[PDB]
Amino acid sequence: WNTSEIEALFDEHAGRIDPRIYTDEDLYQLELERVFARSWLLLGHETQIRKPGDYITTYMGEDPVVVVRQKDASIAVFLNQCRHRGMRICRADAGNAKAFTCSYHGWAYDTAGNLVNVPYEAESFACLNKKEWSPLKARVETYKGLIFANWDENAVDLDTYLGEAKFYMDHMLDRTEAGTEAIPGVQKWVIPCNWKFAAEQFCSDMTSHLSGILAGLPEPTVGKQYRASWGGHGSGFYVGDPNLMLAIMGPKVTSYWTEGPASEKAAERLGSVERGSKLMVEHMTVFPTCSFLPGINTVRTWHPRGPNEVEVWAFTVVDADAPDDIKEEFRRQTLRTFSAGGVFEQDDGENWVEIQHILRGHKARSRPFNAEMSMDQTVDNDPVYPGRISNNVYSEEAARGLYAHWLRMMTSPDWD
Amino acid sequence: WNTSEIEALFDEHAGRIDPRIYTDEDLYQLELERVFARSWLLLGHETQIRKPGDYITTYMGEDPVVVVRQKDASIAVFLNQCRHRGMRICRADAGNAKAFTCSYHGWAYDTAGNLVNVPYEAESFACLNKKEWSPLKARVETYKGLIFANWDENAVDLDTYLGEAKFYMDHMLDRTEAGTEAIPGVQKWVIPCNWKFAAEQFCSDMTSHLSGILAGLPEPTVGKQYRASWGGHGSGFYVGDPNLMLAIMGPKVTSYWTEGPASEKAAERLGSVERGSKLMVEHMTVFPTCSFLPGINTVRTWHPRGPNEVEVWAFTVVDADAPDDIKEEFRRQTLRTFSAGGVFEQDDGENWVEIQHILRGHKARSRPFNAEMSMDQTVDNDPVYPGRISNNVYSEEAARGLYAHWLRMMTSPDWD
Amino acid sequence: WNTSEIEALFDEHAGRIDPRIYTDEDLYQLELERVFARSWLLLGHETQIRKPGDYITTYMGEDPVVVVRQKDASIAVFLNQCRHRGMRICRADAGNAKAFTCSYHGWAYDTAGNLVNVPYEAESFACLNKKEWSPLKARVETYKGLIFANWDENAVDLDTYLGEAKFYMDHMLDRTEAGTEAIPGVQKWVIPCNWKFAAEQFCSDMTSHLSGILAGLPEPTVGKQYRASWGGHGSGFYVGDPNLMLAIMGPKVTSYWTEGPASEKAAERLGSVERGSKLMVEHMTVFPTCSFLPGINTVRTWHPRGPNEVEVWAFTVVDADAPDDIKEEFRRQTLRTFSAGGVFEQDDGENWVEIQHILRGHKARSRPFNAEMSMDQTVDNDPVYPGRISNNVYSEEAARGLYAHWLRMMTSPDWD
Amino acid sequence: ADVFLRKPAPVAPELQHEVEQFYYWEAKLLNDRRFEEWFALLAEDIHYFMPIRTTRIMRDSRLEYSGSREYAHFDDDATMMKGRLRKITSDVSWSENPASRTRHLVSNVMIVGAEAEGEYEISSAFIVYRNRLERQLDIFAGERRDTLRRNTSEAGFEIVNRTILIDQSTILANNLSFFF
Amino acid sequence: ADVFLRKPAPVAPELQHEVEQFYYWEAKLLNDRRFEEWFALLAEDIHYFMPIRTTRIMRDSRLEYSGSREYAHFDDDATMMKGRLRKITSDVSWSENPASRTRHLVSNVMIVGAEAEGEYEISSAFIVYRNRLERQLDIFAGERRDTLRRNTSEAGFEIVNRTILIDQSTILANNLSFFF
Amino acid sequence: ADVFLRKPAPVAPELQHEVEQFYYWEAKLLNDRRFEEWFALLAEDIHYFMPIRTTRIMRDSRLEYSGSREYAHFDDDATMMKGRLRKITSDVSWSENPASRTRHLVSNVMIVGAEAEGEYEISSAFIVYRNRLERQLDIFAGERRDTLRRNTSEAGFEIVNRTILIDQSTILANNLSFFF
Numbered sequence A, B, C: 001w002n003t004s005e006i007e008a009l010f011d012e013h014a015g016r017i018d019p020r021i022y023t024d025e026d027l028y029q030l031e032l033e034r035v036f037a038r039s040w041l042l043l044g045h046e047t048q049i050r051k052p053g054d055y056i057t058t059y060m061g062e063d064p065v066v067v068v069r070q071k072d073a074s075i076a077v078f079l080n081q082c083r084h085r086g087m088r089i090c091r092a093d094a095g096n097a098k099a100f101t102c103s104y105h106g107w108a109y110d111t112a113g114n115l116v117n118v119p120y121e122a123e124s125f126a127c128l129n130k131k132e133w134s135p136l137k138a139r140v141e142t143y144k145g146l147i148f149a150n151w152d153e154n155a156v157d158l159d160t161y162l163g164e165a166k167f168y169m170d171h172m173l174d175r176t177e178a179g180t181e182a183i184p185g186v187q188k189w190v191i192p193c194n195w196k197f198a199a200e201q202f203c204s205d206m207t208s209h210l211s212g213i214l215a216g217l218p219e220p221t222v223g224k225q226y227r228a229s230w231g232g233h234g235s236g237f238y239v240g241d242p243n244l245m246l247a248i249m250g251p252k253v254t255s256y257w258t259e260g261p262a263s264e265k266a267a268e269r270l271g272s273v274e275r276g277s278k279l280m281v282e283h284m285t286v287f288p289t290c291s292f293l294p295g296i297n298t299v300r301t302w303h304p305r306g307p308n309e310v311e312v313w314a315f316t317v318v319d320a321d322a323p324d325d326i327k328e329e330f331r332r333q334t335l336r337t338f339s340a341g342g343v344f345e346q347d348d349g350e351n352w353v354e355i356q357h358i359l360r361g362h363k364a365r366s367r368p369f370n371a372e373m374s375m376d377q378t379v380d381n382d383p384v385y386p387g388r389i390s391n392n393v394y395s396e397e398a399a400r401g402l403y404a405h406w407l408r409m410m411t412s413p414d415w416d
Numbered sequence D, E, F: 001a002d003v004f005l006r007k008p009a010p011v012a013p014e015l016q017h018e019v020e021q022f023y024y025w026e027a028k029l030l031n032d033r034r035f036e037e038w039f040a041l042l043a044e045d046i047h048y049f050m051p052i053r054t055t056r057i058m059r060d061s062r063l064e065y066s067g068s069r070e071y072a073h074f075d076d077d078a079t080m081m082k083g084r085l086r087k088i089t090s091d092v093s094w095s096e097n098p099a100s101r102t103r104h105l106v107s108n109v110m111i112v113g114a115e116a117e118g119e120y121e122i123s124s125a126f127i128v129y130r131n132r133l134e135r136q137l138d139i140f141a142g143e144r145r146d147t148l149r150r151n152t153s154e155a156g157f158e159i160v161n162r163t164i165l166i167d168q169s170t171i172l173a174n175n176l177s178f179f180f
């Protein structure tokens, strides 16, 4: 490839996406090197590893990582690969561990993936460097429950990276003194399409998905959208009405969300009515692969496979003090709608698969896609909302910002 | 690759095919760009879309196209991809449509794939160019029933392209005042082997396939072969006897083909006994991927997948006025012999699969294949037959011509 | 790639393997050209083709070869590909043949794959060169039962290639006047991992595999390791005890191996007690893809597929005069332990699959693997054993030698 | 299990048939897209359950399945189902999505009685085969553990409990739009 | 369907078995390559049908299968079959093609009577598993809708009608040389 | 075959059920990882056989399977099995390997008697479905030819002979750690 022509792949002012970004093999290897190996990725939620020694295995990019709670309750994230011949160190999806031993040749590790013992280094390795030969470690950082990692010892801080995005994440994560716990169990499915489609997207009529709606009723809206200043994040939401209530989450989960004690109070840590209770559904995407829907409350990582396939790891989060049966609702309603079986998300999948399939073709790959929807409709000072806010919510501004940061990541060797 | 060494891949005078043409990935992408995106491809038959608004979906190369009958009974062929994010526009194999809507985001199209409506271009797209943002359209042209398309606005006319090939196609397509209708239903199967093998080929003992023959009997022949002047087409046939009768099509379909009113008369639009009734089986290949067997009357497109896989879309055509039960015979006998289940074509498939499989090997890919069969046995003036005719039918002259045009297509940037 | 940076892939003095050697696509194509197409590969055992005209089909690299016993009881090895259009010539796994005919177009071959007849070369091919147009032939050579081939007419002799490795092969192959017969039937399975992992490896704790052991009991050891001077071979064994007896082969097969007539005598063709009877289990790897375990007596070829997949073809060999029931034991015990179903080898497989899977990742592919185990612990003159012998058997010296020859093969255009 | 720590047994065989025939029918409806008629088989206290499964270390096999207060693939009310039926019927009427081809192979059906007349407890095997649009294909297998109740319908039974034990870690297709 | 708009039912169970055992046998012949013996099961008015299936928009499910005057995968006479048997027998005798490994899993067999003594109407399920030469593998599923006739043979029945409803849009293998 | 050159037949149907239910149970144990209990089903003269299969030219179909003095995938004593059970139990106790998800679909079961009270001879069909760790999946099919013996256990039978006829040339997975 080449610094110059990578850049020609996306025209921001004028809304052209070159479809090759979604398909190209070497381009993919660069994302892996210049996006994932340098940005903050979503490993899961704290609740999924309470006790010391609890682990769960996931991915940063296409590197399997082990995620382990330590004795000082810190969170260690090391590359799930023995450095001897590259056997997998941790082998279940989840569990508790006193230590870790590499099944192939004995090399033993501690709770934070430090090579602590080789059998008979007496006999052999005339002085072996244990530290050097431990797996690669990843910078871990936490945002109000969400676990994040980044390989780059030079990456900016997580708060910096996030920038004023923290604001919109607070809509789901900080609406109660007691934080938020993740309902246990993580659904996983495979969806042969580029990771960017999922992330960009998904469900972007921020006009059908109709039958999904008609499921939750027993028979032209106001809102805004935020584009991040720096790091390609972005969020989109409504203001007052059904949709959340009827349709997606039902009666109870909306009473809870909009009226009554838990929503007024608690939710007034946000220092804003409406910001707390006249909210309704909300998108939100934290570059590159972190996605969640405050109000519904599925969180996902998208994991890249091909440039042509992605895996979807999704769980659900509830306020940790929410009433029993309200937590229960979140559980049922979430899976009813935004799971792989869900009455909404079962369609988002069907789609992207076709999108990718088509791009097997020469002509399908030779003219750009249109992303010029609702240009220059942002002021960047809103009384209430930080960053770069559009006031008609039907725009591809957040999206443009996504591709634009992608472009910045793809063309830097250093940090801009 | 490179203009010069692409050319070294096929030696015409001296019959060497370099096996890499069948396997190479980048070579494949060039075919897609310099063969399929610039030549006339077979979309099907008129009969498969009689009424206005009838569509059927197929392929030009690896681009899915929608093929739709219009109000003025014209045939529109547009790229089956919404230009917004590349969702599939038409989603069934076939049907009737008043209009077309892109399921993902509402963008609405007319019968000939013109973007006619976006929801709320009021709100957004400060003047969107509807024409620009419609799918890519393809030049459509028809030959006596057969539907053809070509993306290149500079490609020669279809009749020109075909050249004197029209002559041999007339053997199946124009043997009656009333033209020809395609029996409905298109068989499709997958056959992991290079498209050129299928096309070149198939069934080229123009010496077994024996058991197939012995199926149609209830227990060294004369003929010629034609190689096109220009565009790499070619045909091969017999003169008087069983084979057609006994064996492939049986009693009735040969009486019909060779004797009696329908064959004498009607067939004498061709202005030649023998050309009409002393014909028997016939090959025929219209570059690059169109193949049919006048006398048997399967037509196929070969659709490219890998350089390593092809799909076979085949139907059957009958004279539109042929007697009921004669049409019926064509239906049964065709499927009995030249379907995926067929007593002939079930073997052609088994073969090519091995051919491709072998070429996974270094040594299998390093010496050329022999295509020197029956060289310089053409006069180019035959009393009756146009073009370049061989008089012993057992030659690879048509084949050489195929690879030779391929070579011309692969090495031009412009039209020679 | 490039002569210089291929070389940087493996640092010998300092034990670094660059994990890309296991994954890289173009690198793979070079192995195919510069390792397999120039080295001596294992086709099987003589016994698998006693009678004239007996064939069996296998692989040299990713080229299918036919292996046929001739009238003068010689062994012909020709590329299993008709030179006309590359159809497969021999089509079963095994059988007996008077001649060979290519099913596609008649071209007929003799027992040693010489094109002897084309139908009607009268009609066509104004003088065809039969010799030229026969398949590629491979140099065949035999070592005390084992059949070997090599495409390179310039490769060194097989004995030279083997060098002083013959010594350690004699531990299984020449321990009786009457040679060795291969028990009929060859197990085959697929194991998605690089061929080098299998070869390097396998089972290299020359510390678990525990449960496998505990299977053969009804409830820190002495030994040495050999690294070849020239061609990247290597072997590793024990001296006196259980392990062989208890555990792997059981009571009878160890009495036979260690004590009594057959082991003392016969085995004293080796001119060494201990070399014959105080042996126990033994590794052994003949570059690049030949592997067997004298004492257990599975032999395997590893066949390369991807850089990402390998097939395992394994049979078992017994001394041709061994008692009936002793031969029988070898049969049962072998399959019980070192088959795809085996209580040992069922785990070796599970492993490598993970190893390869991990390397789908950017970070997993970016730091070297450690192969510095037990450096500079070889004298090269041992009273008894030729070559380069380590005296503590727990080292990666043989392995280093493997990668080192690989490196020599990969970087020569000529023979060093 | 409970109910299956010990071998059924024996019943029937009029009973064995009667159950198997129920399932074969249920499969016919499912594969023929005859969905209105299928939902009609669910008892109004239907609990339709498919837990998420995890790859675990062999001593922890125990922990494989998600328990009842945790996230599932499916955990449906009569009311939630009623609602999915609305989605299906709604796609059929106003929508351009393509139809989906399924097969349900039903097999190792084991029957034990429960308390109440009335109600039987079942273990069966699986393979579902789903092909759709040109070339997509997924194959799923597993165990249905059902509670069936006798019933005055032409169908003869109603499904009060269904527990779907998939033989699948990560879900290998791209959606779960059909019904086990 | 006709015959299957409504639930069978109930028969047999001697009958149920008798049919299932017929199919299991038929599968044995097919998988054991014992073809001479299989064709012998077809009634001389055998009509052996496998329509081409199309991906359709959900309201047009209706239009899925090719009807009877249109192209099929299979539409065979007794005479056409006789002729395929000749192809099979002929490959076995003089030819170097390799033998092909099949399995026919038979399952959800439902039985309703017809007019005549004599003749029964059947719905069954499918999976056919075809492996051949080293690594090729295709898996097919679907429904056989058969008409069976009683018969004085050791087999007990003869197949007068077979309609093979594949769960497959484009055919996913490279040929259809076996027999459902 | 011997025993199957000719059609079973007919038995049972109490018998037919009794056998099928045996197999369904056996599958339950296998798929539920309840291995201790499974081995207990093998007669002490169990001979557990799975020959290697070869792609052969059609006239040589005959030569497909490895005979009894030649290499198999499986050829086990009671003693060898006892020993595999030790491997399984040993992995469970002290080891970090992951558990493996299986399904055994049992089907075309045909029953003929033998000499002795006592002992029955069986042909059945197959599909085994094995998913493990995230995404690995293999599907196997074939025929079990078993000799079963009556027995005073709660299981009712013991497997004295098992012959596993895989529909597989080269083995398409990467190991054969489960049990047919």
Ligand code: FES
Pocket: A082, A083, A084, A085, A086, A087, A102, A103, A104, A105, A106, A107
């Ligand atoms: S790879 Fe050898 S210790 Fe794990």
Ligand code: FES
Pocket: B082, B083, B084, B085, B086, B087, B102, B103, B104, B105, B106, B107
């Ligand atoms: S892709 Fe957005 S309108 Fe179709």
Ligand code: FES
Pocket: C082, C083, C084, C085, C086, C087, C102, C103, C104, C105, C106, C107
């Ligand atoms: S490839 Fe034509 S003779 Fe074999």
Ligand SMILES: [Fe+2]
Pocket: D013, D016, D017, E013, E016, E017, F013, F016, F017
């Ligand atoms: Fe029964």
